[PDB]
Amino acid sequence: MVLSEGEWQLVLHVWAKVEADVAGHGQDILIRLFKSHPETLEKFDRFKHLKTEAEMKASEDLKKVGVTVLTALGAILKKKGHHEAELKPLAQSHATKHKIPIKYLEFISEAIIHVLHSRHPGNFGADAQGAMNKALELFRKDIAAKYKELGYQG
Numbered sequence: 001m002v003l004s005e006g007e008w009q010l011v012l013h014v015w016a017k018v019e020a021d022v023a024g025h026g027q028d029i030l031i032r033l034f035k036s037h038p039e040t041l042e043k044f045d046r047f048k049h050l051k052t053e054a055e056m057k058a059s060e061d062l063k064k065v066g067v068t069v070l071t072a073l074g075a076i077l078k079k080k081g082h083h084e085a086e087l088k089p090l091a092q093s094h095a096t097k098h099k100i101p102i103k104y105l106e107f108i109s110e111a112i113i114h115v116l117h118s119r120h121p122g123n124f125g126a127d128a129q130g131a132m133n134k135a136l137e138l139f140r141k142d143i144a145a146k147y148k149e150l151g152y153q154g
């Protein structure tokens with residue numbers, strides 16, 4: 001697929017607001033994912049044991065990981081579709097080391113869109129959400145094709 005420049009703009013405009021607080025957004029998103037789809041917490045051997053949301057809010061590890069997840073996503077979105085080189089190492093460790101099915105990437109995409117919608121309603125109207133969804137679908141489709149080359153497709 002291919003986003004228009006206008007769609008990239010809407011995506012990079014709401015992302016410039018996320019970047020004013022990357023650790024807080026990272027926490028919100030991962031907690032939104034784990035509440036919604038608790039099976040995904042099992043993949044994180046680091047803090048599979050956190051039982052409640054208050055425990056999650058207080059885990060410094062969970063917050064570091066969130067910052068690492070968002071910072072890498074943001075670097076991919078800034079490429080505007082030209083992301084081949086940033087995807088490779090990423091598709092390799094998620095497919096061979098962590099074994100993250102494509103479906104979990106769909107779950108975290110839904111968590112990102114939920115948080116942006118709550119935190120940034122003025123910059124995240126319908127067109128901006130549609131553009132973000134497009135940018136994340138593009139990201140999943142390219143990562144899925146890379147999984148397949150790497151022998152995982154999952």
Ligand code: HEM
Nearest residue numbers: 040043044046065068069072073090093098100104105108
């Ligand atoms: C927006 C999508 C995602 C991005 C850009 C992302 C990126 C990253 C990055 C950059 C790291 C650190 C280096 C590496 O291990 O590759 C990481 C580690 C990790 N990611 Fe992903 N990730 C994404 C989705 C997920 C999801 C959905 C899961 C699980 C349901 C997941 C599971 C993990 C795990 C288990 C680690 C290890 C964390 C730690 O213990 O160090 N990731 N991810």
